[PDB]
Amino acid sequence: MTREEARRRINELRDLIRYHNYRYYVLADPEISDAEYDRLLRELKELEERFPEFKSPDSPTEQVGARPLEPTFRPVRHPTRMYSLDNAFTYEEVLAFEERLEREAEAPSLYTVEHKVDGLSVLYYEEGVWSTGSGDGEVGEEVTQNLLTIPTIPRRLKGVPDRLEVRGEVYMPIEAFLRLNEELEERGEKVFKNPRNAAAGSLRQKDPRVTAKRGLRATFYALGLGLGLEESGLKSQYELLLWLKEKGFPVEHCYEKALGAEGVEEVYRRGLAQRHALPFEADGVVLKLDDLTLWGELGYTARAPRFALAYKFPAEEKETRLLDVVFQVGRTGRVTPVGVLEPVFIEGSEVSRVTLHNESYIEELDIRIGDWVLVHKAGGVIPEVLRVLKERRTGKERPIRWPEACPECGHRLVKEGKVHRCPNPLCPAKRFEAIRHYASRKAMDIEGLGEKLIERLLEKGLVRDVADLYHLRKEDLLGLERMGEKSAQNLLRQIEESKHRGLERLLYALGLPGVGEVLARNLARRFGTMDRLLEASLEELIEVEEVGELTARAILETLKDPAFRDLVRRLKEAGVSMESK
Numbered sequence: 001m002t003r004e005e006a007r008r009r010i011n012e013l014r015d016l017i018r019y020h021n022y023r024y025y026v027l028a029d030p031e032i033s034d035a036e037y038d039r040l041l042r043e044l045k046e047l048e049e050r051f052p053e054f055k056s057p058d059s060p061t062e063q064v065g066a067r068p069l070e071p072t073f074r075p076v077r078h079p080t081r082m083y084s085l086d087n088a089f090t091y092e093e094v095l096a097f098e099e100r101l102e103r104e105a106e107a108p109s110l111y112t113v114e115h116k117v118d119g120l121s122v123l124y125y126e127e128g129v130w131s132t133g134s135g136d137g138e139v140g141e142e143v144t145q146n147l148l149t150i151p152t153i154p155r156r157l158k159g160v161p162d163r164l165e166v167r168g169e170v171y172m173p174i175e176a177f178l179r180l181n182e183e184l185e186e187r188g189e190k191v192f193k194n195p196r197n198a199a200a201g202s203l204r205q206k207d208p209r210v211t212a213k214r215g216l217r218a219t220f221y222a223l224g225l226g227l228g229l230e231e232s233g234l235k236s237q238y239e240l241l242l243w244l245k246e247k248g249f250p251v252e253h254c255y256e257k258a259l260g261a262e263g264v265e266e267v268y269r270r271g272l273a274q275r276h277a278l279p280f281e282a283d284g285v286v287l288k289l290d291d292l293t294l295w296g297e298l299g300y301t302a303r304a305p306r307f308a309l310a311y312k313f314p315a316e317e318k319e320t321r322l323l324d325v326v327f328q329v330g331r332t333g334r335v336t337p338v339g340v341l342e343p344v345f346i347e348g349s350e351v352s353r354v355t356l357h358n359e360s361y362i363e364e365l366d367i368r369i370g371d372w373v374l375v376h377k378a379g380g381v382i383p384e385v386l387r388v389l390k391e392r393r394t395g396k397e398r399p400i401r402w403p404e405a406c407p408e409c410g411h412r413l414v415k416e417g418k419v420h421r422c423p424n425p426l427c428p429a430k431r432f433e434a435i436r437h438y439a440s441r442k443a444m445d446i447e448g449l450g451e452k453l454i455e456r457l458l459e460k461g462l463v464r465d466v467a468d469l470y471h472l473r474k475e476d477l478l479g480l481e482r483m484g485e486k487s488a489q490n491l492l493r494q495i496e497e498s499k500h501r502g503l504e505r506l507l508y509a510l511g512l513p514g515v516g517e518v519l520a521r522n523l524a525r526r527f528g529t530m531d532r533l534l535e536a537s538l539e540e541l542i543e544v545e546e547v548g549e550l551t552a553r554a555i556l557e558t559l560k561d562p563a564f565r566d567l568v569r570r571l572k573e574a575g576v577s578m579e580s581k
């Protein structure tokens, strides 16, 4: 095969093998075989040896197996340079920007105005086929695989220049950014302060499977190798965005034409209105001269172009003192921290109570009490302490310390892992979760108990904990909330049938500290009865499979809890089987 042909196949092989490694270990819907997949991975290595030049440590071959094809974060120089934009914060400067451009033709020049997203990335394509995709700077990290987890990014193009380098951004939508931040808070990890960083991390994952469960989307706006001077007949910035879309590239961020600094400013304000109506955090707009041909004459500065500019929304950050900190208790039992700030003004709305997330965040940022703090809006939606103003410390700041007891039940607290929490099985703060967990198919299957009925039974006062479900024997109780006997009797038998699930499913229902779906069964077989387990010694618990010293000494305490004993007894009496099924 000719030198060129080998290159082409080598790109295609590296692709299909990356595609199917995704189609397999990530999506789980493979098309080709598990053995017919190795027929390509071996040929990749064959051409990679009779043409050693094309050896790229990005190739699948450098770390193979039946393991997830991880992305090599090796530094890579982009064909063309990826510049950054200069920042304007007033119409005076935007006007001055157009004035700077007046060193040639007339007065009001036409532009294309689009919104500002988060997370810069470049994607190099050869003969339409995709080679790599990197991060940013001057040299960027290779992360092709993690970019495959975003279904919108196209692999094969058509009618494109031999060497195409399309740019754009990979971002995480607010909803997702918020979902991720919640999972992190509960686990006791440090949360992200914005979508840029969260998109960064979610893309800087060894296991591309992780990147997939994160929101991650991508939008594309600019070209490089391939723009006009190469093969594309693109003349307008507006045509480019449509061109990009047509070729299968996802252009989701907003854009529209505008005449002169005056008209640019018209789009700006119309944008500033919708500053928090977009599915993503946009901190400004980007006005670019629409005539591509005029981009050549107009160069770049040391670190920025001349034909384009970034008009930014006002920075909504304010300084204030953290007066006191109060504690709340989540649905899962986790004692959450809340800082009571000196009333300040961010975007008109008055901020006075801000979240401190968890003990880690408080520790990282070194958040104390008498402290002055800079508070901002993460994702431009959730107020939080961006960082403390250290130097202004009077020395009398008090360090944030958790309470001995749970503020919502009085039970002594316990630090399970990285976050403080309430062990009390009957804590009122944990009722809804307790009931649901117990009703799920994995636990004691009780289908009728929808997420709504549980809170209705809780609100009305008919249920305080798990055992009370069995005392609802009276359908007279169930015949008032959207149910009318036809729906009542059907659930009455479910609460009844659930009595019969064994110790295995029963231990998993009462959610003990750490006792998983498997840890419950291995625990139930080894004890036979709830009574026996309640008399377990520390040793007997450790001797069990998967039970660590840390989880043994935990189960041991919950077992002796006068409240756990109570809940168990009241469930026994209702006739719930305490044995192994």
Ligand SMILES: *P(=O)(O)OC[C@H]1O[C@@H](n2cnc3c(N)ncnc32)[C@H](O)[C@@H]1O
Binding pocket: 083, 084, 085, 114, 115, 116, 117, 118, 119, 120, 169, 221, 253, 283, 284, 286, 310, 312
């Ligand atoms: P902002 O001051 O937050 O800077 C964001 C950087 O990312 C690039 N960028 C974001 N969004 C776009 C669009 N829509 N078009 C072109 N470039 C964008 C810029 O290079 C900013 O420097």
Ligand SMILES: [Zn+2]
Binding pocket: 329, 406, 408, 409, 410, 411, 422, 424, 427, 428, 429
């Ligand atoms: Zn409690």
